[PDB]
């Protein structure tokens, strides 16, 4: 048989078979319901639109994300998402395919327990395993050491790994992610004259953020340049017309990552959390961590982010160290590639949580050495 | 003009990366001579320390 | 090395009808990696024969085997068999075969192209992990040979494109990965050439008689033993043990 | 055949075939264990890193020395050290090679007996012999009289020998050694604001001690110069940057040898112990012992130690006696050189302890007159 690698992630579910070079199915993790009445008789509209299809009917649905920051908050919606992924996307029966799932660090144990219970009972998967995003991301990068910064749409976390050994006391988590950036972009667009409120327009704002925003190497210099020059202004076409032009707002949204105080968060910027995590670890491995800094996750796809991060860390770090940042082009799908590599390993076949073990030891079996 | 700017970008990147490999070689050789200078400096330093101790004794 | 196999078919009335030929277990490691005291396939040495200058000059082949990387690693030459007349006989046999000389030129030029992939060189980018080429004359001549574009080939080797979900993304490759990819491409193209040649020979040998029950004939390499056994010897020994 | 000269010592194992000019394999005597769990699967980490390898993985290992003060406290670790020395550093099977071992004077008999038993049983060496670390040092100096001061990492001792006749009643042993100096340096470096606690950074502190510490000819004058001026301060580069500057602590660490009271020990200083040993012998050999002082061991490699020791002993000794101190450049490896010289002697071939003899008469052969 063959193993199945699914990544729920946050805001984007991506699944495929193990041993593949890229996930076969990628689609938003959205559940939509109609908010109107419906007058035509005979069409028989379904009561719930799930997955990418909900994007097509975005204008008559109330889109809801089943997960807020890693943690699942609507279990029925998650079951619908998994059913759609297994049946309408991969068209396979999970009754004969072990499942590898990805889960972020420092999360409630009940989350993993319920995930495994649903997988074993509802879908009767023969076996399943749960892994951490950082380890998979490091796997995909062809590295065995270094500190990996995974910043998705739900949560941004830094994990240092040295010679295949983790440093749990140095793992750092920050709830700032892409969703907060989109919300701040909405909040900052209203000062120009454009108001976006409905959940449908959330997607429009997210698309604008993806297509136009970029990270500035210097904030004050760029603001001064934009205050006088108009060469930074770009136009965007809404799905009905009335193009909108944005100037300095394009490089101000991603600055929240380095300046969380914009949105009221007390914590420090990612560039400072990475340095703090590095200094948490032992003194004898700090050079390798400095020289093997790894980036992953969609939120790290902004142009110019790598240079800004390198400059900030070099400013913080001693002048006698070479700071190198690894930013492969495929940051977004690094975690899934790592999961595929992990599932394709031969020695991993004995680490699966078999159905018999779950039945004997109950749902808690997840928290044994089969972490 | 987009194509003209593309040509501008391509030969600009070519020239700057040629300068980049040149400067990489330069910094490597200067770091090597930096190590050598540090070794000779410390060599002279502790040699003089030892001979000064011999002189005082 | 390869496991030649011949199925001799018969008619309904127990009379000879026709023959079929198949090949199996062809080793690709010999193409790139050779032991110190061993040679590569006879094709390359035969091609370097000086009695045909037209092929050498039209392929822009360096007459010195030492310069090339793939062959110089192994033993350069031995007095095994005179390659000149053997190559001439092979060319004559091809000429008296069913297909024309343009195809023979095609195999010769493709073999020459396989020969030049070793001249490729790559240097790690000063400011980036990805490695870009340094020399391109060998790439230019090779791309001219296959009728491809040197820039497109270099971009593909350096930046392979991959399909994820419903969108294409570019992947980053370092020096080791691109070298492995080049070697794999050479081995795969050689294997496909050999398979196509076998299919063409089978088609030419094929006659229009009905194919009833056949008699198989199987020739395989023996349980070779050395004092320096390696992966290829392990595969051969495993096949012999099975 | 050839004989192996293994010098376990403490903190540095050095070994090599007899008759060689210098030892072939030298490496620290530590055993490292991983104190973390490991997240990456398939690497197959070994459960114990032994020898120089542990020095490259200090940041993810806890290091333990199998030898505290000359004696062996963890026999499994010592067996691992011996196996690594025989099978990796030298790559020679001990089945057909006699072995010469060295140990300090005045050690528990159980230590020697168990060492002999392990060597005859586990490794099955054809024969083995045990020597005092002082007599070999005397051999290496091309002398036949005088006193030898062997200040290693674990223990220090003075052994007077006249015309090849040892004087057991005058042998002196003191437990102050390099390890205590390293601990004191760690303790006093706190007053400057640098904290070293982890066993891994004990190696760092040892490196600073080796590179920068030196012995002062006079104590009060150097203290006055350091308090007044700042020409004695020197800067050291840590593995992760943040160069640190040390001043008065530079020469306080090695003074503990002459001032044991710094670390609370009631015993007298090195020079006083040597002087007392000199007079503990007879009166007709005191002049030669004065004129043939020999130093050995790594701890005696401090710059200027010889001059200070000579001055102190001259102050203690009568004026009309010539005092000379022999400090060859190769103090650290003097013991192994002497052992190699001894093993190459033809007359020594009859002093080996044959395996048959041990089997017939039991492990107590070494203590019996067949030394
Ligand atoms: N090119 C881009 N530029 C800026 N942001 C992007 C880009 N591509 C994706 N993103 C952001 O990344 C997020 C997707 O994160 P994702 O990798 O799905 O996290 P997870 O793996 O936790 O699901 C989206 O919300 C989007 O805002
Ligand atoms: N030049 C030096 N300066 C200061 N300390 C030194 C120097 N050389 C060696 N040492 C110390 O000597 C110790 C090694 O002692 P060693 O001779 O190996 O004892 P043993 O023979 O019992 O193993 C080390 O811990 C080191 O700190
Ligand atoms: Mg993710
Ligand atoms: Mg010693």
Best mutation target among C122, C126, C130 (most B Cβ atoms within 10 Å) is: C126
Segment holding C69, helix H or strand E: helix C69-72
Nearest residue (CA) to ligand 2, atom 20: D9
Q: Would strands A325-326 and A293-296 be described as parallel, antiparallel, or unpaired?
A: parallel
Give the distance from residue D80's alpha carbon to the nearest chain A alpha carbon, in angstroms: 23
C contact residues 219-238, partner A, Cβ 8 Å cutoff: none
| Probe target for ligand 2 pocket from D63, D102, D104, D178, with the most ligand atoms within 8 Å of CB | D178
**For ligand 1, is residue A297 a contact (CB within 6 Å)?**
yes
Judged by its nearest atom, the ligand closest to the C-alpha of residue A68 is 1
Q: Is any Cβ of chain A less than 8 angstroms from the Cβ of C169? A: yes
Give the distance from residue A344's alpha carbon to the nearest chain D alpha carbon, in angstroms: 11
Chains touching A by CB (3 or more pairs below 8 Å): C, D
What 8-state DSSP symbol labels residue C118?
G
- Helix C175-205 and helix C101-116: axis angle, to 10°? 160
Contact B57 D307 (CB under 8 A): yes
String of DSSP letters for A160-201: EEETTEE-GGG-EEE---HHHHHHHHHHHHTTTT----SHHH
Residues in chain D, total:
371
**Number of neighbours of residue A13 by Cβ within 10 angstroms:** 25
Q: Is any Cβ of chain D less than 8 angstroms from the Cβ of B56? A: yes
Nearest residue (CA) to ligand 2, atom 1: D301
**Number of neighbours of residue A218 by Cβ within 10 angstroms:** 11
Q: After which residues is chain D broken (C to N over 2.5 A)?
A: none
CB proximity list for D83: less than 8 A, separation 6 or greater: none
| Probe target for ligand 1 pocket from A72, A102, A153, A179, with the most ligand atoms within 8 Å of CB | A153
Separation between Cα atoms, residue C191 and residue C185, nearest integer Å:
10
Give the distance from residue B39's alpha carbon to the nearest chain D alpha carbon, in angstroms: 14
Token code pair at residue C5: 């196999």
Give the distance from residue A73's alpha carbon to the nearest chain D alpha carbon, in angstroms: 28
The CA-atom distances, in angstroms, between A330 and each of A298, A300, C64, D174 are 9, 11, 43, 64
What 8-state DSSP symbol labels residue D231?
T
Segment holding D336, helix H or strand E: helix D334-344
Residues lining ligand 4 (ion), CB within 5 A? D 9, 152
Separation between Cα atoms, residue D115 and residue D119, nearest integer Å:
6
Q: H helices of A213-319, where?
A: 219-228, 249-252, 255-258, 270-280, 286-291, 305-316
Residues of D in contact with B53 (CB under 8 A): 217, 303-304, 307
String of DSSP letters for C9-42: EE-TTS-EEEEEEE-----SHHHH---TT----H
Task: Find out whether A141 and A113 touch, Cβ atoms under 8 Å.
Answer: no
End-to-end CA distance of chain A, in Å?
24
Q: Is any Cβ of chain A less than 8 angstroms from the Cβ of C168? A: no
Phi, psi of A200 (to 5 degrees): -65, -40
Q: Is any Cβ of chain D less than 8 angstroms from the Cβ of B50? A: yes
Task: Find out whether D31 and D48 touch, Cβ atoms under 8 Å.
Answer: yes
Of the candidates C72, C151, C64, C172, which has an alpha carbon nearest to the alpha carbon of residue C118?
C72
Q: Would strands D127-132 and D99-103 be described as parallel, antiparallel, or unpaired?
A: parallel
**For ligand 1, is residue A206 a contact (CB within 6 Å)?**
yes
**Number of neighbours of residue A79 by Cβ within 10 angstroms:** 15
Contact A284 D239 (CB under 8 A): yes
Tell me the count of B-D CB pairs closer than 8 A: 10
Contact D42 A318 (CB under 8 A): no
D366 Cα: distance to centroid of ligand 4 (angstroms): 21
Separation between Cα atoms, residue A287 and residue A318, nearest integer Å:
11
Give all strands (DSSP E) within C23-165, no chain letters.
122-124, 131-133, 161-164
What 8-state DSSP symbol labels residue A264?
T
Token code pair at residue D343: 């093993």
| Probe target for ligand 2 pocket from D149, D210, D303, with the most ligand atoms within 8 Å of CB | D210
Task: Find out whether B22 and C126 touch, Cβ atoms under 8 Å.
Answer: no
D142 Cα: distance to centroid of ligand 2 (angstroms): 22
Q: Is any Cβ of chain D less than 8 angstroms from the Cβ of B49? A: yes
Token code pair at residue A124: 């009767």
List binding-site positions of D for ADP. Answer: 10, 14, 153, 209, 298, 301, 332
The parent domain of residue A218 ranges over: 178-256
Task: Find out whether A33 and A178 touch, Cβ atoms under 8 Å.
Answer: no
List binding-site positions of A for ADP. Answer: 10, 14, 153, 209, 298, 301, 332
Method: cryo-EM
Contact C169 A14 (CB under 8 A): no
Number of the ligand 1 atom closest to the C-alpha atom of A133: 21
String of DSSP letters for C173-229: --HHHHHHHHHHHHHHHHHHHHHHHHHHHHHHH--SS---SEEEEE--------SS-
End-to-end CA distance of chain D, in Å?
22
CB proximity list for D57: less than 8 A, separation 6 or greater: A163, D32, D49
Separation between Cα atoms, residue D338 and residue A88, nearest integer Å:
81
The CA-atom distances, in angstroms, between D100 and each of C140, D6, D68, D106 are 67, 6, 21, 18
End-to-end CA distance of chain C, in Å?
17
Instruction: Describe chain A by its helix, strand, coil percentages, rounded to 5.
Output: 45, 20, 35
| Probe target for ligand 1 pocket from A178, A250, A300, A306, with the most ligand atoms within 8 Å of CB | A178
Residues in chain B, total:
57
Best mutation target among A164, A292, A323 (most D Cβ atoms within 10 Å) is: A164
Tell me the count of A-D CB pairs closer than 8 A: 78
Q: Is any Cβ of chain D less than 8 angstroms from the Cβ of B53? A: yes
Q: Would strands A4-7 and A99-103 be described as parallel, antiparallel, or unpaired?
A: parallel
Separation between Cα atoms, residue A246 and residue A295, nearest integer Å:
28
| 3-class SS of residue D143 | coil
Contact C125 B24 (CB under 8 A): no
Separation between Cα atoms, residue A201 and residue A283, nearest integer Å:
48
Separation between Cα atoms, residue A73 and residue A92, nearest integer Å:
27
Q: Is any Cβ of chain C less than 8 angstroms from the Cβ of B27? A: no
Phi, psi of C166 (to 5 degrees): -125, 15
Comparing CB atoms, the residue among A281, A318, A351 nearest residue D242 is A318
CB proximity list for D98: less than 8 A, separation 6 or greater: D1, D3, D4, D125, D126, D127, D128, D129, D352
Chains touching B by CB (3 or more pairs below 8 Å): C, D
The CA-atom distances, in angstroms, between D291 and each of D145, D295, D330 are 9, 13, 20
Give the distance from residue B4's alpha carbon to the nearest chain D alpha carbon, in angstroms: 47
Token code pair at residue D111: 């230590």
**For ligand 1, is residue A178 a contact (CB within 6 Å)?**
yes
CB proximity list for C161: less than 8 A, separation 6 or greater: C168, C169, C170, C171
Q: What angle do CA D260, D294, D307 make, to 5 degrees?
A: 60
Task: Find out whether D254 and D301 touch, Cβ atoms under 8 Å.
Answer: no
Comparing CB atoms, the residue among C129, C164, C165 nearest residue A326 is C129
Number of the ligand 1 atom closest to the C-alpha atom of A29: 23
Nearest residue (CA) to ligand 2, atom 3: D210
Chain B residue with the nearest C-alpha to that of D212:
B46
Separation between Cα atoms, residue D93 and residue D125, nearest integer Å:
9
Token code pair at residue D94: 């001990």
CATH number of the domain within which D222 lies: 3.90.640.10
String of DSSP letters for A64-124: E-SBSSSSBS-HHHHHHHHHHIIIIIS---GGG--EEEEE-SS--HHHHHHHHHHHHHTS-
Of the candidates D369, D371, D356, which has an alpha carbon nearest to the alpha carbon of residue D120?
D356
Residues of C in contact with A26 (CB under 8 A): 164-166
Q: H helices of D197-253, where?
A: 199-212, 219-228, 249-252
**For ligand 1, is residue A296 a contact (CB within 6 Å)?**
no
Q: Do chains C and D touch (3 or more CB pairs under 8 A)?
A: no
Contact D303 B53 (CB under 8 A): yes
C169 beta partners: C162
């Amino acid at each position: 048989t063959t193993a199945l690698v699914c990544d729920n992630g946050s805001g984007l579910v991506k699944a495929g078979f193990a041993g593949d070079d890229a996930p076969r199915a990628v689609f938003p993790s959205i559940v939509g319901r109609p908010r109107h009445q419906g007058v035509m008789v005979g069409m028989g509209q379904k009561d719930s639109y799930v997955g990418d299809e909900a994007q097509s009917k975005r204008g008559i649905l109330t889109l809801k994300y089943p997960i807020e920051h890693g943690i699942i908050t609507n279990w029925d919606d998650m079951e619908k998402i998994w059913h759609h992924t297994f049946y309408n996307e991969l068209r396979v029966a999970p009754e004969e395919h072990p499942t590898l799932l990805t889960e972020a660090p420092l999360n409630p144990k009940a989350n993993r327990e319920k995930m495994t219970q649903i997988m074993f009972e509802t879908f009767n998967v023969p076996a399943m395993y749960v892994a951490i995003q950082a380890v998979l991301s490091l796997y995909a990068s062809g590295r065995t050491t270094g500190i990996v910064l995974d910043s998705g749409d739900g949560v941004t976390h830094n994990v240092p790994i040295y010679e295949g050994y983790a440093l749990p006391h140095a793992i750092m988590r920050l709830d700032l992610a892409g969703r907060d950036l989109t919300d701040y972009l909405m909040k900052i667009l209203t000062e120009r004259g454009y108001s976006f409120v409905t959940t449908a327009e959330r997607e429009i704002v997210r698309d604008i953020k993806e297509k136009l925003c970029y990270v500035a190497l210097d904030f004050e210099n760029e603001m001064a340049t934009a205050a006088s020059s108009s060469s930074l202004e770009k136009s965007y076409e809404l799905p009905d017309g009335q193009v909108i032009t944005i100037g300095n707002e394009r490089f101000r949204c991603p600055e929240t990552l380095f300046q969380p105080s914009f949105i009221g968060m007390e914590s420090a910027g990612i560039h400072e959390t990475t340095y703090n995590s590095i200094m948490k670890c032992d003194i004898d491995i700090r050079k390798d961590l400095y020289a093997n800094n790894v980036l992953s996750g969609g939120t790290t796809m902004y142009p110019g982010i790598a240079d800004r991060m390198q400059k900030e860390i070099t400013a913080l770090a001693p002048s006698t160290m070479k700071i190198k940042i690894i930013a492969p082009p495929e940051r977004k799908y690094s975690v899934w590639i790592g999961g595929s590599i992990l599932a394709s390993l031969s020695t991993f076949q004995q680490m699966w949580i078999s159905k018999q073990e779950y039945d004997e030891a109950g749902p808690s079996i997840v928290h044994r050495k089969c972490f | 003009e987009a194509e003209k700017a593309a040509d501008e970008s391509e030969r600009g990147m070519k020239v700057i990366e040629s300068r980049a490999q040149k400067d990489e070689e330069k910094m490597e050789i200067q770091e090597i001579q930096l190590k050598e200078a540090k070794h000779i400096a410390e060599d002279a330093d502790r040699k003089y320390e030892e001979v000064a101790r011999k002189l005082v004794i | 090395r390869f496991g030649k196999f011949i199925r001799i078919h018969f008619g309904a009335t127990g009379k000879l009808a026709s023959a079929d030929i198949e090949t199996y277990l062809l080793e690709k490691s010999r193409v790139i990696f050779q032991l110190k005291a061993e040679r590569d396939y006879h094709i390359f040495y035969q091609i370097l024969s000086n009695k045909k200058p037209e092929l050498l000059d039209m392929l822009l082949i360096t007459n010195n085997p030492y310069d090339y990387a793939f062959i110089s690693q192994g033993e350069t030459t031995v007095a095994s068999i005179d390659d000149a007349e053997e190559l001439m006989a092979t060319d004559n046999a091809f000429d008296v075969l069913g297909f024309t000389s343009e195809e023979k030129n095609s195999m010769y030029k493709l073999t020459g192209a396989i020969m030049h992939f070793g001249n490729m060189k790559f240097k790690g980018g000063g400011g980036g992990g990805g490695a870009e080429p340094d020399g391109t004359e060998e790439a230019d001549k090779s791309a001219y040979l296959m009728g491809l574009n040197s820039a497109d080939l270099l971009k593909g080797l350096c930046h392979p494109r991959v399909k994820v979900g419903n969108e294409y993304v570019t992947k980053g490759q370092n020096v080791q990965q691109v070298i492995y990819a080049t070697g794999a491409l050479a081995k795969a193209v050689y294997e496909r050439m050999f398979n196509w040649m076998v299919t063409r020979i089978n088609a030419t040998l094929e006659t229009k008689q009905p194919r009833q029950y056949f008699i198989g004939v199987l020739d395989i390499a023996g349980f070779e033993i050395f004092d320096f056994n390696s992966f290829e010897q392990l595969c051969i020994n495993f096949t012999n043990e099975k």
